[PDB]
Amino acid sequence: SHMAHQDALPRLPVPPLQQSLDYYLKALQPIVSEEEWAHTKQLVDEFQTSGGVGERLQKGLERRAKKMENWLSEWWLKTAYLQFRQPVVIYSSPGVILPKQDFVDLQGQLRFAAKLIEGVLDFKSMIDNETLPVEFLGGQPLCMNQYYQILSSCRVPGPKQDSVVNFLKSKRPPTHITVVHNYQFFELDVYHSDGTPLTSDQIFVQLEKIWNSSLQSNKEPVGILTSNHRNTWAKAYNNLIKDKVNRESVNSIQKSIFTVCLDKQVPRVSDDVYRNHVAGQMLHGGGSKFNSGNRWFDKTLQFIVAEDGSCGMVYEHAAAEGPPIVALVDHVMEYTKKPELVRSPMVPLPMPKKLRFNITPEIKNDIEKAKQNLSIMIQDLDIMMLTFHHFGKDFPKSEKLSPDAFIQVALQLAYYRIYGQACATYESASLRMFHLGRTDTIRSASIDSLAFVKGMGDSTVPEQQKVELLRKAVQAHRAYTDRAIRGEAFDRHLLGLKLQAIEDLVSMPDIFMDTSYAIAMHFNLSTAQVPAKTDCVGFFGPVVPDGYGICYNPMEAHINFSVSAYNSCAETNAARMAHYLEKALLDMRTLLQNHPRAK
Numbered sequence: 001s002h003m004a005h006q007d008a009l010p011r012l013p014v015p016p017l018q019q020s021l022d023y024y025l026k027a028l029q030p031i032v033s034e035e036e037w038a039h040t041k042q043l044v045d046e047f048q049t050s051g052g053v054g055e056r057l058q059k060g061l062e063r064r065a066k067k068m069e070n071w072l073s074e075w076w077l078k079t080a081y082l083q084f085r086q087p088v089v090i091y092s093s094p095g096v097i098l099p100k101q102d103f104v105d106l107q108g109q110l111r112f113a114a115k116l117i118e119g120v121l122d123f124k125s126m127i128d129n130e131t132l133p134v135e136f137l138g139g140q141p142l143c144m145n146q147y148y149q150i151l152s153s154c155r156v157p158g159p160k161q162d163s164v165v166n167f168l169k170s171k172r173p174p175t176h177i178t179v180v181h182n183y184q185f186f187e188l189d190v191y192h193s194d195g196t197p198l199t200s201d202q203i204f205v206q207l208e209k210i211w212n213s214s215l216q217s218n219k220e221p222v223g224i225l226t227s228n229h230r231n232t233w234a235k236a237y238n239n240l241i242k243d244k245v246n247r248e249s250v251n252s253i254q255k256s257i258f259t260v261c262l263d264k265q266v267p268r269v270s271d272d273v274y275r276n277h278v279a280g281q282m283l284h285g286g287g288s289k290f291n292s293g294n295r296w297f298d299k300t301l302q303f304i305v306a307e308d309g310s311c312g313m314v315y316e317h318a319a320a321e322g323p324p325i326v327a328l329v330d331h332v333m334e335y336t337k338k339p340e341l342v343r344s345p346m347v348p349l350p351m352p353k354k355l356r357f358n359i360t361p362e363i364k365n366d367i368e369k370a371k372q373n374l375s376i377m378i379q380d381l382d383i384m385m386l387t388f389h390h391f392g393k394d395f396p397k398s399e400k401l402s403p404d405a406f407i408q409v410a411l412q413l414a415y416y417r418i419y420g421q422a423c424a425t426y427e428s429a430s431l432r433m434f435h436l437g438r439t440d441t442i443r444s445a446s447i448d449s450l451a452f453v454k455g456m457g458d459s460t461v462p463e464q465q466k467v468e469l470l471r472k473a474v475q476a477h478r479a480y481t482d483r484a485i486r487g488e489a490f491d492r493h494l495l496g497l498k499l500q501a502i503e504d505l506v507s508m509p510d511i512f513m514d515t516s517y518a519i520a521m522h523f524n525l526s527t528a529q530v531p532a533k534t535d536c537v538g539f540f541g542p543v544v545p546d547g548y549g550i551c552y553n554p555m556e557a558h559i560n561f562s563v564s565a566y567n568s569c570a571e572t573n574a575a576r577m578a579h580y581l582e583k584a585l586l587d588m589r590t591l592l593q594n595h596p597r598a599k
């Protein structure tokens, strides 16, 4: 970002070896057997002995930190995304459900879309001018690098690994966005010759031309190709761009500031599954027969505007994290609520260029294969959207407890109630207080949380006694959270030690081939909090076949929840997990209310 600000930021540290290993052993106690823990304990001692393997790997990481801006940056981006070969849809690209808008006709839909585009361009002005306000977390300045990765960027299919292109700072920065309607892409300039951005009224006029130039959905949904396996898409992509026209259209899409998807009307569904269907529409598009072909999942930022008033977005994870994305959302949404002023008669405008695609028998086959693949993915995705209206951050705070920790502890309780045991739990932690920092792992399953979930369901433990255990678990989780954001967690560290071993060309350390580590890294619960002023909520698929994907936005009086699971695993059920979570939160409130502290 603004290089001045970035330079004053501390560099991602490398936690002490013995410290991280100690935290690791503690986080394992609640998720592994005594026999397994005892063995790991032995591997740890040997691993960190003087003159041992761990010490050499640690030294390597410290050297890496001295010759790079962030010793973790490239490794993370690579292992977490660029090398992740599964489809980006559902398994990687997070989806976001925004507050439903009130437009009831085409003009209204296009009206909001125009306002949204203008709001994004407004936010972009701060990025180009580097005037974007500095943010804080834990009272520390935060990295703003992510904001210069979301716009005018795109992921690119690679035979072995993927790459990312960013034109935000190219010789002549893109001044156009891409609009998709009925699977057809259009190149739309949102800036005038002089350099000033088009007005909402002006953008609206352009969207109309675009909409009328693609009234029928007869064209092939070429964009659905971006939802297939990366290896398959890499090859299909290479073929697709062999045509001059096709390559030209793709280039326009990749360079576009961002994409706006004008989704078509979808079959009315039951009211008890409506929100789940809107979440699916934002995450994957619903299917090849709906709006899945009306997208380009390699594009970093995709804003979706439904015909029935619904709206949201889906973004490619290799670019940024949640906070930056939601920050842009809060600004855009708040912008669409701003009144109108200058309604002067706008001057004529050019016809948005239509990014055509020359289909061939081979390309057609690729599209069909993509449809088939996407159909399987969607059929296996189990989503449950839960709006916890009972309460929000308000109650936990009135109890002098961290809301997020309260929620995480509630999730642990809910899981234990269902399966009778704890499980490796992952909660995203922001490392933005460090230059180029992304995230680390907060492990919600601990000695204190397990002690709580056990005593909580113990009909032989005094209700007041469960209160102490509850507060202790919450405090323990808050402590872990504070350490994580300060670069004191151990997950990314341990990952670094393993990649370092690989780089040092030494045999894989036993500690990394240990069963305990496999268990610890197999997150049956993958979660993250998406704080936002806008009453929205994010969602993503589970990270493992037998796990859940839980995302939430804690508001003051309520909490927006999203729970995902796979139908391939009979042991998991999104609705059930959501219900136990809701009940878990309530029971914890009841417990605390039944035993006030003040007198």
Ligand SMILES: CC(C)(COP(=O)(O)OP(=O)(O)OC[C@H]1O[C@@H](n2cnc3c(N)ncnc32)[C@H](O)[C@@H]1OP(=O)(O)O)[C@@H](O)C(=O)NCCC(=O)NCCS
Residues within 6 Å of the ligand: 137, 320, 321, 322, 323, 393, 396, 397, 398, 399, 400, 401, 402, 403, 404, 405, 428, 429, 430, 431, 439, 481, 485, 528, 529, 530
């Ligand atoms: C882990 C994380 C979410 C915790 O955030 P947090 O703001 O500390 O969450 P908390 O629940 O502790 O605090 C929320 C509110 O409760 C309050 N609070 C916390 N502890 C409290 C206490 N003991 N008593 C009273 N109030 C308390 C906070 O002041 C805050 O108040 P606000 O509503 O006025 O802002 C954050 O540190 C982080 O890392 N976020 C990034 C996650 C991410 O990257 N997500 C996207 C992944 S792609």
Ligand SMILES: CCCCCC(=O)O[C@H](CC(=O)O)C[N+](C)(C)C
Residues within 6 Å of the ligand: 094, 095, 096, 321, 322, 325, 427, 428, 429, 439, 440, 526, 527, 528, 530, 538, 539, 540, 543, 551
């Ligand atoms: C709208 C975005 C909601 C959060 C998505 C998220 O948490 O992505 C995580 C990023 C990280 O922790 O590195 C990964 N995860 C989805 C697997 C938790």
